[PDB]
């Protein structure tokens, strides 16, 4: 039995017209939620020098995506919505894990998940560079100018539990092991 997980689902199937929400029981926090996107958000990576590695997402394309993910989460919990960073778990769930070329990449999505969308015309609080690293276990890093290109087809989320958690509703990436 090996290990499989990630924050963002890449290169899979896309929703036909509107965004989808897959799960075994949506009211079960222990159960993993599956987000399916209508339009694919592009993801570009680059390793130009030692030890600079980064992952670039479009800000206007991501805020459009997230704000529209909140209008669908509203359809189950008609309340204000928060997208936030996870509090625990292994590296593959705390970072966006992927192997690009021959090098495995771990990057932080602290920038993607830290928004609050109101009940009314969905709002933020008021590009996106994801700091990335590669495992320096086996063996010494490879020089530039390596590039990665992929598509965000979905997201793997977990809703925060409790009654004590009033006000808005909070979701964090991870899961959850198996995919759709």
């Amino acid at each position, epitope marked *: 039995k090996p*290990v499989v*997980s990630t924050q963002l689902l890449l290169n899979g199937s896309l929703a036909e017209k509107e965004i989808r929400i897959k*799960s*075994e*029981d949506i*009211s*079960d*926090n*222990a*159960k993993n939620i599956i987000v399916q996107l209508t339009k694919p958000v592009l993801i570009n990576c680059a390793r130009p020098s030692n030890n600079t590695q980064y992952c670039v997402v479009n800000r206007t394309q991501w805020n459009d995506t997230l704000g529209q993910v909140a209008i669908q989460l509203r359809k189950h919990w008609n309340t204000c919505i928060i997208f936030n960073e*996870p*509090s*625990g*778990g*292994d590296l*593959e*769930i705390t970072t966006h894990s992927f192997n690009c070329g021959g090098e495995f990449f771990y990057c932080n999505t602290s920038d993607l998940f830290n928004s609050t969308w109101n009940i009314e015309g969905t709002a933020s609080i008021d590009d996106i560079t994801l700091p990335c690293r590669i495992k320096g276990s086996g063996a010494p890093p490879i020089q530039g100018v390596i590039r990665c290109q992929s598509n965000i087809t979905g997201i793997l989320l*977990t809703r*925060d*539990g*409790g*009654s*004590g*958690s009033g006000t808005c509703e909070t979701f964090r990436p*991870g*899961g*959850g*092991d198996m995919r759709d």
Partner: antibody
Amino acid sequence: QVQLVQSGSGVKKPGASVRVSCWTSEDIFERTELIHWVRQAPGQGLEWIGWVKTVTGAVNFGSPDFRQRVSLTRDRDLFTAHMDIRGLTQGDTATYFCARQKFYTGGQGWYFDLWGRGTLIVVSS
Amino acid sequence: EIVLTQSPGTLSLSPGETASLSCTAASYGHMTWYQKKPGQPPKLLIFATSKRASGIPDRFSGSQFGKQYTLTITRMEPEDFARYYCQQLEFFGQGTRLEIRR
């Protein structure tokens, strides 16, 4: 007489921390999806604190007040689980229980077939 | 906590008599039932509203009537005299204690 094994009861000082542990056998551990932590103060009921997944390590807490102080970890090779409580207060004087949930399908609900006999934490100065 | 209220808090019964413990959940999700004695770990009896765990006998049963989720203990035995809590997922009931009526 019998699984799963919980840490010895203790007297802790207000403001301190406590590493409450839980451990079982490989065959009992390989059949567990989650490890939940639930508490009971004397004269109060069973209250869910949080959960930890035996595979991914992922967590979930009952309130914002458990999120910043409670840390739920597990050792996949030694077949254990742990609960760290930061900023100990008299409100935290309770019997901390642990419970396992078998690999289940959504809808059925939560069902804890095995329970640790408990660990009494007394926040006393 | 709005949902998950339970009642009565105390059931005065004699052995042989039948207990009827009710849990009121503000939603249609499945109920679980635990037996709890003083200074003893909770013992799972019922899960999935109607389904009893291996090693639990025909005396204990589980049922639902909308938001009313009830546990029945027919032909009550001395050991069965304890405290009972229900959890609907992450939530637990206020509790109910079964005492010897005299």
